[PDB]
Amino acid sequence: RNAFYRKLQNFLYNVLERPRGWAFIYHAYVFLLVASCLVLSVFSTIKEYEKSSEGALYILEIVTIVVFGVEYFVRIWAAGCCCRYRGWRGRLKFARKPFCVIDIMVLIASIAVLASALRSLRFLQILRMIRMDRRGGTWKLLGSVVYAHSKELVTAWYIGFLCLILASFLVYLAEKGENDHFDTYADALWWGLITLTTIGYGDKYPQTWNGRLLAATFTLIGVSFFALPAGILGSGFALKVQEQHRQKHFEKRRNPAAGLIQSAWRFYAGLKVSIRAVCVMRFLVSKRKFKESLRPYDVMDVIEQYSAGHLDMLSRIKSLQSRVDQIVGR
Amino acid sequence: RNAFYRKLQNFLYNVLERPRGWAFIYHAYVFLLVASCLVLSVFSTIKEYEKSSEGALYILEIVTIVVFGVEYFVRIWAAGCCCRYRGWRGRLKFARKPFCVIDIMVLIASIAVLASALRSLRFLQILRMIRMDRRGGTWKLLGSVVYAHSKELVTAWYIGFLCLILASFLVYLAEKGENDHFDTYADALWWGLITLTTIGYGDKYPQTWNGRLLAATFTLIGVSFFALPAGILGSGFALKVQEQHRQKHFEKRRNPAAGLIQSAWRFYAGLKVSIRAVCVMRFLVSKRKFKESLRPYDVMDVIEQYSAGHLDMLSRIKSLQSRVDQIVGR
Amino acid sequence: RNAFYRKLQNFLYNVLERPRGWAFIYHAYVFLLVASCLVLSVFSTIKEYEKSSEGALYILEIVTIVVFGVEYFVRIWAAGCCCRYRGWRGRLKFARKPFCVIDIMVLIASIAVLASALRSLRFLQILRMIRMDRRGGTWKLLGSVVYAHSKELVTAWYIGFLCLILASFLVYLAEKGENDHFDTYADALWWGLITLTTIGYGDKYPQTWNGRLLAATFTLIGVSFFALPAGILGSGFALKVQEQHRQKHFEKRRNPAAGLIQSAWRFYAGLKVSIRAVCVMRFLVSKRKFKESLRPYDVMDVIEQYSAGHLDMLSRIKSLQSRVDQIVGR
Amino acid sequence: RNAFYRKLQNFLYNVLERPRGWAFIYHAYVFLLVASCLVLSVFSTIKEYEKSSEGALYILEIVTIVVFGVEYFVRIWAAGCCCRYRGWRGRLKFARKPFCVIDIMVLIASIAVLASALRSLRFLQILRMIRMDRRGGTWKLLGSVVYAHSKELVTAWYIGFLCLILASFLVYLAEKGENDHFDTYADALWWGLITLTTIGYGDKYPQTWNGRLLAATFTLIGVSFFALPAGILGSGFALKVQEQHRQKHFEKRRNPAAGLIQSAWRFYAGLKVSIRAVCVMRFLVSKRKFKESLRPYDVMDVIEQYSAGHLDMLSRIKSLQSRVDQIVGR
Amino acid sequence: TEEQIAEFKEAFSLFDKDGDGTITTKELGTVMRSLGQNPTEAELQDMINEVDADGNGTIDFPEFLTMMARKMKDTDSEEEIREAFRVFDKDGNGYISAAELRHVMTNLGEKLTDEEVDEMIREADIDGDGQVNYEEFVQMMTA
Amino acid sequence: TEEQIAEFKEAFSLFDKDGDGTITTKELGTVMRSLGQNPTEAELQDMINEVDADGNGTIDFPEFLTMMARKMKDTDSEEEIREAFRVFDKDGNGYISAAELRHVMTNLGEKLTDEEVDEMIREADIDGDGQVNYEEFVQMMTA
Amino acid sequence: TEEQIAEFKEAFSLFDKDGDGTITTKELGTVMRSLGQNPTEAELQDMINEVDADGNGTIDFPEFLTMMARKMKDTDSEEEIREAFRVFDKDGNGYISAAELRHVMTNLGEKLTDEEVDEMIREADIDGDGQVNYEEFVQMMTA
Amino acid sequence: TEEQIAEFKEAFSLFDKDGDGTITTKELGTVMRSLGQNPTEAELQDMINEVDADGNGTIDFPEFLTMMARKMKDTDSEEEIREAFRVFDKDGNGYISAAELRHVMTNLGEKLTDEEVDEMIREADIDGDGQVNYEEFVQMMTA
Ligand SMILES: C=C(C)[C@@H]1CCC(C)=C[C@H]1c1c(O)cc(CCCCC)cc1O
Ligand SMILES: C=C(C)[C@@H]1CCC(C)=C[C@H]1c1c(O)cc(CCCCC)cc1O
Ligand SMILES: C=C(C)[C@@H]1CCC(C)=C[C@H]1c1c(O)cc(CCCCC)cc1O
Ligand SMILES: C=C(C)[C@@H]1CCC(C)=C[C@H]1c1c(O)cc(CCCCC)cc1O
C-alpha cells in the first residue's frame, strides 16, 4: 500500500518541515520541552538546587534526546516526498542539510555525555533552539527592515550618542567634586548610558542641584532619542506587515507563469528558422514578463496599469477620430 | 400603555446592554463603583487600615450588591425587546447567558458572605470587572493584531532572547569573581532580564569595567529589541484603526442585502421547473454576491471595480468599432 | 496716517494673536521668560538657595509683570483689526475673552503681591503658561486621537490591569513569607505597578527564585502591555499628521465657497414666484455642496469622483449607442 | 596613462566622498578606529588603567593620525574628478570646504600634541566623528520630521509637563512630612521627572500610602505621555521612509529635464522677434514644468493626472458628440 | 421521483437548447433573456462558477439534479439572512417597521412590484403589528 | 396669506406641469431649462434629496409652502457663510479687499455679470473704503 | 556553421522586409501577423527592448546570430521555471497532478491545443504515474 | 531702444491678431500653429499663467517688453539646469559622455534634429574629449 504510506509520510513531512496551520502546536510542544531544559539547566547552576535540578534534568535529557532522535528519523523518512530527497542519494543529500547535520551532532553529543559537560549541554540546548528558525527568516526580516530605515536609525544613534556624551560630560563637571558616584569620566558615561536608556539602576545619580538641573534638561531629550530606534523599527515592521498583507491579495503570478511555461515549451518545440526566431523572441518576452511580475508586485503597478489604459484610451479614440474623418468625405 | 413601556424598556436595554453613546457614562459610574471596591479590598489587607477599610467596605458592599441586583432585574426586564428573549422561555434563555449566570452567582455569593471570605470577595470583584467586556472583544482584537504580526513579534522575541542569554552569560563571565551580585548564572540571567527590559531595579549591576563595557554594548541593542514588541503592536493597532475608519465609509452592504432578500423570497415564491431553476441559480448568485461583499470589504475592491470597468471599456469600444465597420460598407 | 498705523497694528496682532511663521520666536522668548520664573520659584523653595533665589526672582517678577502688561496693552490696541473688536464696545468684548480676563487678573495679582503668596505665585506662573494654548488645541487634539483609538487603548488597559493584578498576586504568594518587601498585597501591587511600568525603583523586588521566575514570565508580557498605549497613541498621532498633510493639498473649498456666495446673494436678490423658488432650491443645493465639501474632505472622495465619472461614461456611451442605432435606419 | 589614473581616482573619490555601496565598509572600519580612540580616551581617565590606557593610546594615535593624513591626501588628489575641484585653484577651493579645513586642523593638532592636552584630544575625536555626517543630513532629517509633527510633539510635551508638575506637587503634599525624600518641592519635581520618564533611580520614592496611591494614578498616565514623543517620532520616521520608498519608483524627472534642456538651448538659439518670443515663453513653460516636477513628486499627482484625463475624456466625447450631430443633418 | 426527475430533465433541455448535455453561458443567457430578464456577462459567469461543481465550465443533468435536490432546510442560509437583516435593522434589536420596509425594500436590489410587497406583508406581518419580526419569517422560510 | 398662498400654488403648478400634485425630476428639469439654466442629473437629484422631506422622492404643495415659509432669519446660514469668507479671506482678520473680490468672486462659482458685481459693491461697500467687511453684510443678509 | 549562418540570414531577411539591415517594429509585427499570431504594441516594444543590445531600437544580423547562438544550457532559466512551478504546485512538495495540469495549463496563458497537451504528457509523464515531477522535465529541457 | 521697441511691438501685433491690445489663448494658439508646432490646452494655459503678471488672463505690450527685456544674466536658471544635468549624470561627478548625450538627449523631450545635435556638440564639446562638462557650457549660456 504505497498510496496510504505516501499520504501519511507527506502529512508527517508537512508537520515536521515548514508547517502552515495546526502543525505549529506540535512544534510549540517541542519548544516547551527544549525550553524546560534551559530553565532546568539554569537551576542546575544553583548550589542549593543542584541536586534536585540535576536529578530532574537527567530524566528530562533522556526524554528530549529520545524525542529528538525519533523526530530526526521520522523526518529523514518523510523526506521522501521531495523529489531531490528520494532514494539513497536523495536522503543522504537531505541529511547533508546544515540543520540536519547539526541535529545529528547534538543527538550524538547528548547520547555521549549522558553515557563535566554542562557548558556543552547549555550550548546544545541553544543550538536546538536556534534550529527552529532553520532558514534565517528572523535574521533576514530584521536585516531587511533595518536596512530600509538605515538612515533614520543612524541619525537617531548619532544624535543619541552626542546627547549621551554631552550630558554625561556636563553632569561630570557639575558632580566631579561633590559626588563620589562621578569619580571619573567613565563613571559619568556609565551613568548617562544607564539613564538615557531609562534603565536607571540607581547606583549613580546626580546630587548637586546644578547637576540635577543639567541631568533633567538632557534626559528629557536623551530618553526620547534612545527610545527612537524601538519606535522606528516597530513602525517599520507594522508597515511592512500591512504592505505584505495588501500585496498577497491580487496574486498576479498565475497567468504569467502559465504563459512562461507555454512559451518555454513552444520554444523547445528559411521559414522554419524565422518561426524558431519568433519563438525564441517570445521566450525572452515570457522571461521579461515573469520577472516584471516578480519584482514590483506592488500597488503602484495598478497606477501603471491605469496609465497604460489611459494611453490606450487616447490611441483608441484616435482611430475612432480617423473613422469619423472618413465619414466627412462620405 | 404598552407603547411607552416598550419605549422605556428599549432605552433601558440600550443603556444596559451594548451601548453606543452617552450610556457609557452610566457604565463608567458603575465601573468606578466596582473600582472603589478593588481599592478598598486592597486597603483591607493592611493591618493598620484594616479597621476603617473594612468598616467602609461593608457599606460599600451593601451598596454595590444592591446596585448589581437592581441592574440585573432591570436587565432581565428590558431583555423583552429581543425576540429571542420574549416570554418565560425567552427570558429564561436570556438568563442562561454566561455573563448573566455569572452575575446572579456573584450576587448570591455577596449576599451570603455579607450575611473568612476575603479571597472570594477579591475574586468576585475581579469577575464583575471582567464581565464588562461581555464578549471577549478585547481578547479577540488583541489576538487578531498579534496573529497579524506573528512573524515580526516572534523574530523580535527570538533575537531579544538570544541577546539576553548572550549578554547575561558574558557579563557573568566578566563578573563571576569580583561581584557578589553575579554569584551564579541565574543571577546574571535575572540581571539581564531586568536591564534589557529597562526595569533596572539596581539590586544587581555590573561593577568590573570589562563587565560594564559588555553590559553597555549589549544593552544598547537589547533594550531596543525588548521594546520592539510594544512598538510593533502599537503600530499594528493604529494601522488597524485607520483601516477600519476608512472601511466604514462606503457601506456597500445595503444593496447586496436587498438583492439577497428579494432573491431569497422569489426562490421561495416544463417551463415552471425551468423558471424555478433560474430562480435557485439566482439565489446562489445572491449568496455569492453577499459573501463577496462580506469578506473583502476593502479599498482594493475599488481597484477591482476599476479593472472591471477597464475590461468593460475595452468591450464597449469593440462594439463601437464593429458599428463603424458596418458604416464602411454602407 | 491711518494706513501705516493700521499696517503696524495688524502686524502686531499677527505676532501676538495666532501667529504663523517667525512670530513664534517672540513667543518662545516669552515662554523662556515665564519658564525661568518656574525654575526660580522652585529654587525659592530650597532653604539653602532661598536668599539668592528670591533676590533674583524679585527682579525677574518685575520684568515679567512689566512685559505682560506691555503685551496686554499692545494686544488690546492691535485688536482693532478684527471687526468684532472695534471701538469701545468691540475692545471691551475683546477684553471679555477668558484668556484676556485671566491675563489682567494675573497682572493685578502680581502687582499686588509685589507691592506670604508663594503658592499664588506658583499658580499664576502655571496659568500664564497655560494661556499659551489659548484655545484647547492640545486638549482637543489629544482627545480626538484618544477617542479614535478608544477600543485599542481600553483593551490594552484591561489586559495590562489583569496582568498587573495577576502577577502581583502570584509574586505575593511566592514572597509573602521570605521577603519583607511583600508584607501585604498592597506592597505587591505597588511592586507590580512599578515594574510593569518599567520604573523599577528597586525598593521592592522578588528574591525567592519561584518569585523571580513568576516575575520574569509576567514582566516579559506586562511591560509590553503597559508600553502599548504609548505606541498606539504615537502611531495614531503620526498617521493623523500624514492624513492632514495629504488632505491639505487639493484645497477644494474655493469653488464651493464661491458658488455658495453667488447662490446666497441671488436668493436674496406667477413666474416671479417660480423663479424665487428655483433660486431658494439652488440655495439649498449650495448649502448641501458646501457641507459635503466640509465633512469628508478626504482621499476617498477621489474614489467617489471616479465612480461618478464611471457612471457618467456609461450614460454617455448609451447616448452614443442610441446615435449609432439611428444610423442603422439611415 | 591618464585614462587608468582617472579611473582609479574616480573610484577613490567615490569611496571617500559620498559612497553608495560596499564603500561604506571602509568608512565603517575608519569609524571603528576613531571609535576605539573614544574608548581608550575614556580608559585614560581612570587612574588604575591610566598607564596601560595611555600606552596603547599613543600607538593608536600615531596610527589614526597617519590614516587620517593619508586619507586627506588621497582625498585632495581624487577631488580632481569634480570640475569645480580641478587645477590649483579648484583643489584649493576643495580644501576650503569646512570639513576639509576641520580635517587638516585636527591633523596638525594631533601632530603637535603628539610631538596636558587630554581635553583637546577628546574634542578632536568628537570632531572627527562628527565629520562623518559632512552635510548635516542627520540634523536636517530630524528637523524635518520634528517640524512635521510639531503640534503633536508640543501637545505631548505640554500635557506631560502639566502631569509632571501636578503629580509631583500632590505627592509632595502627601509626603512632605513622613518622608525625608521629599524635603522640598525641588526634590518632588526631581522624583516626578525621574519616574514619569521611567528612569526610576530609587533615590526618591513615595512611602505614605496616600502618596503611593497618587503616584500610581498619576504615573499610569505620565509614563505614557512621556513615552509619546518617542512613538510619535518613530512613526513619523517610518512613514517618511515608506513615502520616500514609494516616491523613488516613478522617477518622472527625466523627460521634464530633457524638455528643459532642449527649450533652454532653443531659447538661446517682425517674424523673427515673434519666433524668439514664442521661444522665451516656451522656456518659461519648461521652467514651470520642471518646478512642478520638483516639488509635488507625490502619489497625489497621479490623482491629478487622472483628473486631467478625466476632463480630457469629457472634452473628447464632446467632439465625438459634435461629429454625430453633423451626421444628423447628413 | 420519476415525475420530478422527468420534469427536471425537461427544464434542463429547455436550458440546453443544443441538446449535447452541456449547458454553456450562451444557452442560459438566451433562454433567460427569452424569459424576460436581461443578464450581464459577470452575472452569467458567476452563475457558471456557482453551478460548475465539475471543473470544465459546463453543466450536465446530474449537477442540476443535485442542485434542485437541495431543500430549504439544508441551505444553511439562516445566519446570512440574519446578518443581512441586522444591517437592515437600524435599531439592531431584531424588528423592522412596516413603513421602513415599504420604503427601503421595494426601492433597492431586485425591485419588486405592489403584489410582491402585498405578499411579503401577508406572509410576514402575521400579527399586523407593523414592527415585523423576521426570525419567525426566516424559520418558516427554512421550512 | 391668501395672496401669498395663491402665488405659491401658481408657482408650484408652473413647476408641476403634469398637474397630479407630485413634482418629479423631469418637470423641474424641463421648466428650469425653459428658464434658461441647464442642470445636471446630480444637480436634480440633489434638489430632490434636499426638498424631499416626505420619503417618496416627489414633492407636494405643503412642502413648498413650508420651504418658502422659511425666512432669512431662521436659515441659520450665518456660520456657514462666515467660514466660507474666512476661506476667501487670505489674511483671516475678516476684511476683503475690493480688487481681490472683483478678481475672484466674478471668476469662480456661479459666474456673475457686471451689473451683479456693481450691486454687490453697492450693497456691501457702503463706506466705499475698498476693504469690504462682510459681518455687517451677512447680518443685513439675515434681515 | 556556414549552413546555420546562411539559414539565420535567410530568416533575418524574412524578418527584414526592407532589406536595409535594420529590423523595426513594423516589419516584425507584419511578418508575425503573416505567421498568424496578432501582437500588441506593448508586446512589440518588449521584443525590441529585449533584443536591442546596441542602443538604437533596431537590430542587425550580428545580434540575431548572437541570440540564436545561445544554447539551452546557458539560458539560466532553471530557477525561474522552478519558482513558476512552485507557484503552480499548491502542495509545494514538487509534484503536479495530471488532472490539475490538464485543467490549468490548457486554460491559461498561451492556450494550447489537444495535440499540445498530448505531447506535454508524452515528454513529461514518462512513468505515467499522474503526479508528474518537473525537475527531471526541466533538466531535460535544458538539455 | 527705439528699434528694439518697434520690433517688439511688431512681434506683439503678429501675436495680437485682433489688434485690441489684449492677447488671448486663441490668438497665441492660432499664430504659433501657423508657425508649425501644435500646442495643447494645458500648454496654452500654462503660457497664460506664466506670462499673466497683471491678473486678468490677458497680456499687453508692457508685459512683453518687460519679459523680452530679461537677459540671460538674471534668469537665475543656473541651479535649475544644474540639478537637471545631475539627474542626467548617472555618475554624479559633473561630466556627460558624448555617446550617452547623443542617445538620450535627441530621443526625449523636445526632439532635436541632426543639425541640432551637431550644434550642441560644436558649442559644448569645445575640447572634443567626449566627456562634455556642462558647468562651462551653462556659464556661457548665462552670457
Ligand atoms: C539594531 C538596532 C535596533 C539599532 C540599529 C543598530 C545600532 C548600532 C543600535 C540600534 C540602536 C540602539 O540600540 C540605540 C540607539 C541610541 C543611541 C545609542 C548611543 C551609543 C541607536 C541605535 O541605532
Ligand atoms: C503578547 C505580546 C505582547 C508579545 C508576543 C508574545 C510573546 C511570547 C511576548 C510578547 C513579547 C515580549 O513581551 C517581549 C519580547 C522580547 C524578548 C524576551 C526574551 C524572552 C518579545 C515578545 O514577543
Ligand atoms: C490617556 C492615555 C494615554 C491612555 C488612555 C486612558 C487611560 C485610563 C490610561 C492611558 C493608559 C495607561 O497610561 C496605561 C495603560 C496600561 C494599563 C494600566 C493598568 C491599570 C493603559 C492605558 O489606557
Ligand atoms: C526633540 C524631541 C524628541 C521632542 C521635541 C522637543 C522637546 C522640547 C522634547 C522632546 C520631548 C521630550 O523629550 C519629552 C516630552 C515629555 C514632556 C516633558 C515635560 C517637560 C515632550 C517632548 O516634546
Author numbering:
A (entry chain A), B (entry chain D), C (entry chain G), D (entry chain I): 70 to 184, 195 to 348, 535 to 595
E (entry chain E), F (entry chain H), G (entry chain F), H (entry chain J): 6 to 148
Paper text:
Among the neuronal KCNQ channels, KCNQ2 and KCNQ3 form homo- and hetero-tetrameric channels and are responsible for the M-current, which contributes to the stability of the membrane potential. Each KCNQ2 subunit contains six transmembrane segments (S1–S6): S1–S4 form the voltage-sensing domain (VSD) and the S5–S6 constitute the pore domain (PD). The C-terminal domain (CTD), which contains three helices, namely HA, HB, and HC, interacts with the calcium-modulated protein calmodulin (CaM). Here we report cryo-electron microscopy (cryo-EM) structures of human KCNQ2-CaM in complex with three activators, namely the antiepileptic drug cannabidiol (CBD), the lipid phosphatidylinositol 4,5-bisphosphate (PIP2), and HN37 (pynegabine), an antiepileptic drug in the clinical trial, in an either closed or open conformation.
To probe the role of CBDB, we introduced an alanine substitution on the residue Phe104 in S1, which directly interacts with CBDB. Electrophysiological studies show that the activation of CBD is largely affected in the mutant F104A. We next collected cryo-EM data using the F104A mutant sample incubated with both PIP2 and CBD. Interestingly, two different KCNQ2-CaMF104A maps were reconstructed from one dataset, which were designated KCNQ2-CaMF104A-CBD-PIP2(-)-I and KCNQ2-CaMF104A-CBD-PIP2-II at 2.7 Å and 3.5 Å resolutions, respectively. In both maps, CBDA molecules maintain strong densities but those for CBDB are barely observed. Interestingly, KCNQ2-CaMF104A-CBD-PIP2(-)-I remains in a closed state with no PIP2 bound while KCNQ2-CaMF104A-CBD-PIP2-II is in an open state with the PIP2 bound. The number ratio of particles used for the final reconstruction of KCNQ2-CaMF104A-CBD-PIP2(-)-I and KCNQ2-CaMF104A-CBD-PIP2-II is ~4: 1. The differential distribution of the KCNQ2-CaMF104A-CBD-PIP2 particles with only CBDA bound in closed and open states indicates that with the presence of PIP2, (i) CBDA alone is able to stabilize some KCNQ2 channels in the open conformation, which accounts for ~20% of total channels, and (ii) CBDB further enhances this stabilization and dramatically increases the ratio of the open-conformation channels.
